[PDB]
Structures are given as C-alpha cells and as structure tokens.
Subunit: 108 residues, 4 copies
C-alpha cells in the first residue's frame, strides 16, 4: 500500500549519476518514530550510494543499480525496491539525452 | 474508471510541504452539480491539509499523509485515494532533492 | 498494444483548460495512410474540444471530459480512451496549483 | 524485472522527432560487460533510428515507431520494448503541443 519515493540524488565518480529509489515498506507506528528516516533511513542510503559510486572506478551503471537494490533489500522490512540510475548524457545531436537502468526487487 | 487529480498544494509548518492527492470516485450527475468541488470538495481538502500541517509541531511527514488519506476516506463515496507528501530538500550535494511518502487507501 | 498520446491542448472558455487524451486503437496499414491523423484524426478532435469548451457557458470540467471521452468513443475503432481536463489554478497559497478530472472509457 | 530507459533522442527528417525507448531485457553478467551498451547497445539503436527517420521522405510517425520496435525486437534477448515517437508541434493555439505514437511489443 505504502511507499517512499526518493528523487534526484546527484552522485559523482566527474561524470554525474542521478539516482531515484522507491521503497515499498510498512510505515512504522507514529508512537515509535521521530522522523521518516526511522521507518526508512534514506540518509544512510544516500551516503552508501555516494560511496558505491565514488569508489574504485569499477563503476558500471547496472552494477550501481544492482548494488543499491540489494543493499536496500538487506533490510527485511522492504517488500520491494525500484532503483533507477540515470547517466545524463553530454548533449550531442542524434543521441539519447538520458540513459538509465531501472532495477527491481521484491520478495513477497 | 474516473478520478480527480489535485497537484501542487504548498503548505507550511517554515519548511515547505508539497502535497498531491488522487481521488477515485464516481462523478456526480451534471444535473446536480454547479462545480467539480460538488463531486469532490478539494477546497475543504486543501484547508484541512493546511491546518493539519500548520498545527502543533507534532508533524511527521507520514503522519500528514495518513491523516490526509483517512480524512479523504471519511467520505464513503471515495473508492480509493493516493496521497503524496513531498518534503523538497535544501539542495546539499549527495542527498536526495526530494523525499516523499505516498499513502494509499481503498475499500472495494 | 498501441496508443496515441495527445498532450497540452490549451482551450479557452478566458479561463484556460489544458487537455490530454490517450487513445488505444490499432494503427492503420502503412499502405492506407498519408498521416497519423488517418488512423486517428486528432485535428478534428482538437477543434471539437475547442468548440465544446468555448460553447454556451454551460461548461463543467467533468462535463468537458465526459463529452470528449464519449466523442472519441463514437469511433468504434477505439478500444479505450483516457481524457484529462486540467484547470491550472491562479497561484494562491495553500491551494492546489492544478485540478484535473481524468475520464476513462473502454469497450473490450 | 529489469529495464533500460532511453529518453530524448532528437532526430531530423527539418521537422524534429523526439524518441524514447524502454527495453525489458536481463542485464548481462558484470563479469562480461565493459559498459551498459554491452547488455543493450543504445548507441547503434540511436544511429539506426536517425537513419530510419533521415531516410527517403517516406517517414510516417507510426512507421518510425513500428520499425524501431521491430528493430529492437530482432534481438532475441529483449522480452519487450515500448517505443514513443513524439512530433513536438509548432505552438499554434487550440492544437495539441505534442502528438506521439507509442508502440509496444513483447514475446513472452
């Protein structure tokens, strides 16, 4: 039913990568959280994603997506995640402005 | 079949919150309404949402969404609602530009 | 499988209405058409929609959508249509920037 | 599960055509690729699409979509493709700003 949508994280290897993540996950009780990030910590997600991408050049666009996806899935409360990694292209004519892989995972 | 899409309500606690609501609901007869808001009163929805958010600081982003969602669902003509609350982020590098919870409800 | 997406028709009653239409419909043979509009005539659709909206003030936002929808459905080749009528709001704080009804029809 | 989203290829016959393609297709092993384009070569896709559109004027908007779609489908690793060809309209009042055909194919 409920999801969290994280848009427009700009991370560098530099060549820009723009990342979006959707996380399907039950919202914690109001009684138990002092922020959204207590249900789902998109703060540590954004650091981890910045490290993954900044790391030893071994940085394939789908590899970033798959690692982000699995990282999110480590947390057994996530029913499913959808991770988009966009490499915005230098604007040269007859090419795509934007190329993105979108990775999905879910358990059920 | 038919829905009403309400985009871009900016409400303050201040920190901006941008809210969208979709409402699935049968449209009233042309014979009986003098405006859209007679099918679904997005005018009172926008006040109520501005009060909820402006209120005694106790304002969690998911709490706003859940309350909006339940408020809309009070009206038994609504088959389902989808409420997005967006907290547009101060633009600091390696963070998400936008973080949003999206709440869904439906009866059937 | 195949659809035609018509975005951003601005029509006046004046207060602006912005209309989008999607039409699900089998594409005609290359052998038989000299334009897209020979499969689906979005030219006459845009006139008709401009007349409907410009007409004797009796112009409800859902009424426009329903009439557009039925008009498109008159053509028995259409499997389904989705018509969005948007009334972009004067920007006053704590209100929705945009309010839209979206109408769907399909036969099967 | 996994898809590749290619947005905003501007191609000329001139009248601009803006093309998007989504490709559903299993991502190759990290072990075997040095780029995304090794899973799916959107580089040759963008040339081919620019040739198709630039070619002997015989250029219907749905014909471009269908040819792109079939071309992508030639590669038996693609589970499905969705090709949008947009002809952005000269902005004349009471007409659609944008008219697009969207073609889908899939095997299963």
């Amino acid at each position: 039913a409920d999801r969290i949508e994280l848009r427009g994280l700009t991370v560098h290897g530099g060549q820009r990568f723009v990342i979006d993540v959707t996380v399907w996950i039950d919202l914690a009780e109001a009684a138990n959280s002092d922020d959204l990030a207590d249900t789902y910590d998109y703060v540590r997600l954004a650091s981890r994603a910045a490290e993954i991408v900044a790391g030893p050049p071994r940085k394939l666009i789908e590899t970033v997506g798959a690692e982000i996806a699995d990282h999110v899935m480590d947390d057994q409360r996530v029913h499913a995640v959808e991770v988009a990694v966009h490499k915005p292209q230098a604007p040269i004519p007859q090419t795509f402005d934007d190329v993105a892989v979108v990775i999905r995972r879910s358990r059920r």
